[PDB]
Structures are given as structure tokens and as C-alpha cells.
Design a protein around this ligand. Structure first.
Ligand SMILES: CN1[C@H]2C[C@H](OC(=O)[C@H](CO)c3ccccc3)C[C@@H]1[C@@H](O)C2
Ligand SMILES: [Fe+2]
Ligand SMILES: [Sr+2]
Ligand SMILES: [Sr+2]
Length: 325
């Protein structure tokens, strides 16, 4: 592989990462209180769980994976239409909601073995959808339906979380969930998987992420890495750094990475829901007391975003400046 993609020695993945047998798989068609309790335990102990029988149509999940794979099968001349000034966009502010192809890495500067299609999904209007990919022909109609359904499921999970925390229902149904970035991640086969990463270890900076996958490669840090079993009809729920802060660390954030494969490609669909850049983030005042003092001072999501996207010296470098007590 090009030296551009060689990860620092300490960040390279070992070849035999064990299956995470303790990753919670939560059936959302259990009794209401059982679902609340199981989600609450998973958020407190792990910060990563899968949801099944989640009410999002399996046919739509399959049709969305199909059109996402079809997009990444498009020729160069079509993909160039999503490369501003002839190259992929960077994950930096301002993060625009129009569709672009993105490159990502860390500055021992190296690049992730990954192509990402990203666009906003909320609110859905003619202007936003007109800024989505023109090809494949069915991308817009399928992904419009998918984005509405994934948001519906995310808001159900956030209200289960509200009941678990003792927050009012709809606590996150506001500016805290206003941004919905859909990241379609393409991992082509890699000649040297021992030296590269599809995605370096990270928290998602946002509130909550739902991830759809068909093939292995996703791993979680529990200094022990575990493999997250692909269930094609499930969503992986990753709690973000923003929810870790708002819950005053009552909930864990998911630290995860993606490893490369020498033989086959992989497509994942990540729906990243979180605050508008104008938001002020702080521990929920409703949960604070002399026994539970705030561990973070209030901060600008925009200010956090700039640090989160640039400083990868530590997983929580984004929130380090705002730590108190
Ligand atoms: C591996 N990368 C991490 C950083 C970046 O994330 C983003 O771009 C999100 C998109 O909501 C973001 C969150 C919080 C602040 C700024 C950006 C792109 C991807 C994600 O999987 C997480
Ligand atoms: Fe992520
Ligand atoms: Sr180009
Ligand atoms: Sr257009």
C-alpha cells in the first residue's frame, strides 16, 4: 500500500480480534419496561448495542444497502461530480449538508482506507434532496424513505434513554438532534491489512449513531478490542461523546474502529444524529446534585467540533478543555 495509508505502529490492528459475545442484542418487541431496562444497562455498561425487531422495514434496509453499493460501483466521471475542486472534501467545519465524497485521516499523518459519501437528511426538503447524488436514479427516493425511517427509530431509542435516565420524553427532540448526517462508507480490498485502518479508533462526536452493516470489520474498545458481529437486519447503536457529556458520564460513549480486508470490499451506512453547530452542550441540569456534580462546563458544539475533527491525540480530546471537578 501507499505510505499515505500506513498507520502508526501502536494504532495497527492485531490479526485475531475476538467476537464481542457480550455486545447486547436488544429485541425492541419485548415489553416496554424490559426494552427501557435493557437499553439503559447497555448504555451504562457498554455504549454500543444492536437492536432487532426495530420496526424499520428489512426490505428498505436491503434496498438502501443495494443503492449505496450501486453508488460506489459508479465510474470516476460520475464520482468526480461529488469532489469539490477535483478532490474529496475534508471532515472540517463548516460541514455542509449537500452530498460530497470525503477523505479522512489523522495529523505521523496518515489516511484511513475509506471513501465516505456524506449528506444531511433533516429536515427533508426539495433543496436538500436536489443536492444528493443524481446516480443511481433511485438513490434519492430510497434514501429519503430510509432517512425518515432511521430518524423515527433513533427518536424511539432516545425516548427509551429518556425513561432510563428519568428525563422527560422528547428531551432530545429539539436542537440536540437537528443534524442527521448519513455517511455511506466504502472499504475497498486492502493489500496490507496489518498496516492500515478503515477508520481509526474514535467516539462519534454527535449524540447517537445507527450503523447498518452486512460484513465484518467493525471493532469496539472495551486496551482490549472486540469484533462487533454483523447482523444484516439489525442496527448497531453507538452512543456519541455528546450523550456521554449530557448524561454526566452515567452512559459510556462507543469507542470503535474499522479494519480492512485483503479479499472483499465492505459498505456500511452510518446515520449520525446530533446537535446543530449553534448548540450549547452541558450535563443535563435535571440529573445534577451535590452527589452528582457536573464533570463538564457548558461549551459551544461548533468549538468542540473543530477540536474533535482535528485533535486525535486522545479519544476525548474534543471534550478535554471542558472537563471540571
Ligand atoms: C470516523 N469519522 C468520525 C469523525 C467524523 O464525524 C463527523 O463528521 C460527524 C458528523 O455529524 C461529526 C460529529 C460531531 C462533530 C462534528 C462532526 C466522520 C467519521 C464519523 O464516523 C466519526
Ligand atoms: Fe464512528
Ligand atoms: Sr479527482
Ligand atoms: Sr443538484
Amino acid at each position: 500500500v501507499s505510505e499515505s495509508f500506513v498507520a502508526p505502529l501502536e494504532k495497527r490492528a492485531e490479526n485475531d480480534v475476538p467476537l464481542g459475545n457480550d455486545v447486547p442484542i436488544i429485541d425492541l418487541q419485548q415489553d416496554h419496561l424490559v426494552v427501557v431496562q435493557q437499553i439503559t444497562k447497555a448504555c451504562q455498561d457498554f455504549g454500543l448495542f444492536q437492536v432487532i425487531n426495530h420496526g424499520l422495514p428489512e426490505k428498505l434496509m436491503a434496498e438502501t444497502m443495494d443503492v449505496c453499493k450501486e453508488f460506489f460501483a459508479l465510474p470516476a466521471e460520475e464520482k468526480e461530480k461529488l469532489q469539490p475542486k477535483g478532490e474529496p472534501a475534508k471532515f472540517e467545519l463548516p460541514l455542509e449538508q449537500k452530498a460530497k465524497l470525503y477523505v479522512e485521516g489523522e495529523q505521523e499523518a496518515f489516511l484511513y482506507w475509506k471513501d465516505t459519501l456524506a449528506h444531511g437528511c433533516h429536515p427533508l426538503d426539495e433543496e436538500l434532496v436536489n443536492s444528493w447524488p443524481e446516480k443511481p436514479a433511485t438513490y434519492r427516493e430510497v434514501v429519503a424513505k430510509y432517512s425518515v425511517e432511521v430518524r423515527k427509530l433513533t427518536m424511539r431509542i432516545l425516548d427509551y434513554i429518556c425513561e432510563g435516565l428519568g428525563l422527560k420524553l422528547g428531551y432530545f427532540d429539539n436542537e440536540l438532534s437537528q443534524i442527521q448526517m448519513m455517511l455511506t462508507n466504502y472499504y475497498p480490498p486492502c493489500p496490507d491489512p496489518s498496516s492500515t485502518l478503515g477508520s481509526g479508533g474514535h467516539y462519534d462526536g454527535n449524540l447517537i449513531t445507527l450503523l447498518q452493516q452486512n460484513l465484518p470489520g467493525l471493532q469496539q474498545l472495551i486496551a482490549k478490542w472486540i469484533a462487533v458481529e454483523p447482523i444484516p437486519t439489525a442496527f448497531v447503536v453507538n452512543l456519541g461523546l455528546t450523550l456521554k457529556v449530557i448524561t454526566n458520564e452515567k452512559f459510556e460513549g462507543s469507542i470503535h474502529r474499522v479494519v480492512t480486508n485483503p479479499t472483499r470490499d465492505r459498505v456500511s451506512i452510518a446515520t449520525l444524529i446530533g446537535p446543530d453547530y449553534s448548540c450549547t452542550i452541558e450535563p443535563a441540569k435535571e440529573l445534577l446534585s451535590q452527589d452528582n456534580p457536573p464533570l463538564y462546563k457548558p461549551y459551544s458544539y461548533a468549538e468542540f467540533g473543530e477540536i474533535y475533527l482535528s485533535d486525535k491525540s486522545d479519544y476525548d480530546a474534543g471534550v478535554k478543555p471542558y472537563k471540571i471537578n
